[PDB]
């Protein structure tokens, strides 16, 4: 439940006898954790809010000019000085102008002309800072079992529902227990500070559109820049790159503004994440969190019930998710109170020997009135199989055909692994990380190689690194020395970055 259709979910199975499982949560997909004898719990990150950001260095992307003025001097007399040059609100440029006997001053050298123009800014974009403290993550988890198909994305007063829980996680309280009534409580220790880089990301606003911008792109930008506190009549310490002092001929000088600049910033931003704002807080919808799951206080509600023997009707019928699982929504006719639904994948209906794996929870209908609804999902075997629901001589059976042999599943698993590593960097080694010694060695050497690779390359974008990938591919292909492998290795890294976006 809550993860049936997300199309980017991965199953985390097994643990050290039920002690704990490492899990990385991402915004795109969700993780369904299944234990040996415990209810399957689906966990998903929802939104990451940032709070009380502190404004820093707001820029100007649209200038406005005002009453120009100018002053000139004799070929020998010195340099021009307008009385408006002693004001920090005027742009002033000094140049040389042809003069003599025609304009009014007798001598024929070049003169000196100063022009000044007042600067007014309509619109400005501001950049705000984000400390990795006071950063709140909101995790939503739900459980399989007894909820009918309707309650998959239904967001309501989930405090009462008893099957779905919501957890806030902040650097001031990284540990939390989600109390699932009657199922126990899922303990969840999580690391919020190391989530996503939040010491290099400014929150940038232009006009009701907010981005996450990398610092060192919000400092090497050439526009009139204030600094921090907006108090009264602002002052911009630039007076250049937004006013163009175009010269005429025969001592004519003109001042123009460049227009509105909000088109170069929208295209200068490419590959910077989007965000949205609510009140004083900023909701980012793209992030990365790593929570260790201490699921040793989860129980099974269904056990010790007696199994229902009335009838079962397949109403919505069986359906196939993107990963192979099979969701079934059954309706129970009998009035047998709380009860245990018998369901098993089976082939060779002569002797129903359970095959496949039942990734549900403790199956069980909790309603007691007349007709109840339930939804359970099964992981079927690759060949043809029969979904069997019911006890005896009134068993409803459905025919199911799953496509791809185990080799296909292994290849798709390795593709998922490559994508996850390319996206998450070193941390990807912690996905199903019960944690041994081999996994830790892998994490270490991948961390070293990652630091080196990010220090050499990683100042390049899609096209540029496709280029350097092909070039290093050739160079390694015909170098004839022993370093060829090294160069060829580089290609993989670089080229794989391109074919996973």
């Amino acid at each position, epitope marked *: 439940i809550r993860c049936i259709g997300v199309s980017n979910r991965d199953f985390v199975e097994g643990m050290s006898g039920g002690t704990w499982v490492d899990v990385v949560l991402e915004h795109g997909g969700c993780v369904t954790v299944m234990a040996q004898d415990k209810p399957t719990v689906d966990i998903e990150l929802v939104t990451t809010t940032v709070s009380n950001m502190a404004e820093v260095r707001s820029y100007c992307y649209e200038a406005s000019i005002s009453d120009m003025a100018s002053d000139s001097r004799c070929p020998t007399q010195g340099e021009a000085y307008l009385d408006k040059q002693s004001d920090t609100q005027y742009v002033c440029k000094r140049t040389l102008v042809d003069r003599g006997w025609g304009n009014g001053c007798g001598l024929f050298g070049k003169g000196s002309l100063v022009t000044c123009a007042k600067f007014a800014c309509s619109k400005k974009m501001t950049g705000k800072s984000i400390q990795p403290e006071n950063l709140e993550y909101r995790i939503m988890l739900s459980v399989h079992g007894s909820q009918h198909s*309707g309650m*998959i*994305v*239904n*967001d*309501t007063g989930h405090e009462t529902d008893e099957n779905r829980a919501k957890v806030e996680i902040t650097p001031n309280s990284p540990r939390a227990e989600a109390t699932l009534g009657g199922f126990g409580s899922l303990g969840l220790d999580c690391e919020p500070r190391t989530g996503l880089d939040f010491s290099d990301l400014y929150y940038l606003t232009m006009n009701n559109k907010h981005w996450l911008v990398h610092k060192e792109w919000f400092h090497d930008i050439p526009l009139p820049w204030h600094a921090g506190a907006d108090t009264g009549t602002p002052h911009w310490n630039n007076k250049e790159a937004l006013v163009e002092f175009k010269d005429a001929h025969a001592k004519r000088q003109t001042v123009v503004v460049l227009g509105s600049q909000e088109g170069a910033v929208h295209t200068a931003l490419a590959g910077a994440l989007e965000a949205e704002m609510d009140g004083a807080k900023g909701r980012l919808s793209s992030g990365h969190l790593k929570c260790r799951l201490k699921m040793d206080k989860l129980r099974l509600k269904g056990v010790s019930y007696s199994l229902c023997t009335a009838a079962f009707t397949f109403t919505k019928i069986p359906a196939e998710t993107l990963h192979g699982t099979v969701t079934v929504e059954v309706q129970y006719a009998g009035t047998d109170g709380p009860c245990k639904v018998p369901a098993q994948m089976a082939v060779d209906m002569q002797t129903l020997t359970p095959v496949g794996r039942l990734i549900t929870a403790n199956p069980v209908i909790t309603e007691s009135t007349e007709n109840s609804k339930m939804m359970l999902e099964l992981d079927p075997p690759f060949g043809d199989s029969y979904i069997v629901i019911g006890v005896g001589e009134k068993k409803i059976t459905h025919h199911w055909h799953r496509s791809g042999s185990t080799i296909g599943k292994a290849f798709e698993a390795t593709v998922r692994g490559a994508k996850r590593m390319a996206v998450l960097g070193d941390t990807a080694w912690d996905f199903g990380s019960v944690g041994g010694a081999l996994n830790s060695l892998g994490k270490g050497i991948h961390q070293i190689f990652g630091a080196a690779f990010k220090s050499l390359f990683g100042g390049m974008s899609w096209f540029s690194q496709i280029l350097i990938g092909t070039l290093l591919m050739w160079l390694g292909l015909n170098t004839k020395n022993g370093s060829i492998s090294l160069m060829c290795l580089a290609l993989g890294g670089v080229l794989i970055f391109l074919s996973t976006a």
Partner: nanobody
Amino acid sequence: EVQLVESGGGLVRPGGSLRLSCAASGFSYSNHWMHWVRQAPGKGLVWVSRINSDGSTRNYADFVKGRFTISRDNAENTLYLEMNSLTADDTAVYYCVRDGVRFYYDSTGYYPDSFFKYGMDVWGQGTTVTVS
């Protein structure tokens, strides 16, 4: 029991504009489709407009050639219908309606599937507007 309350109706000269509002309480407003329907005095019900949960999908009947604009504020549980270039044909009582049947299947109320099962279960008392 959810109560829908219409507001803003009044007499207007031909060609005028008016902003009708609707207050909802007692249900998850942010997750339901909303409708405006109208009824001329002594005439039948005439469907006017509908809006989804976020406002990304606005549907209007053919009679309103872009004159009317439907919108909503989920945090305020409010629905708005701004009407421009009103004529005598616009004199009617307008009911603000909640689509409760759609909420049964699509709890997000966002995806505007074609020919989806619907039902306008909860009606307001309606506000009378006369373009005279």
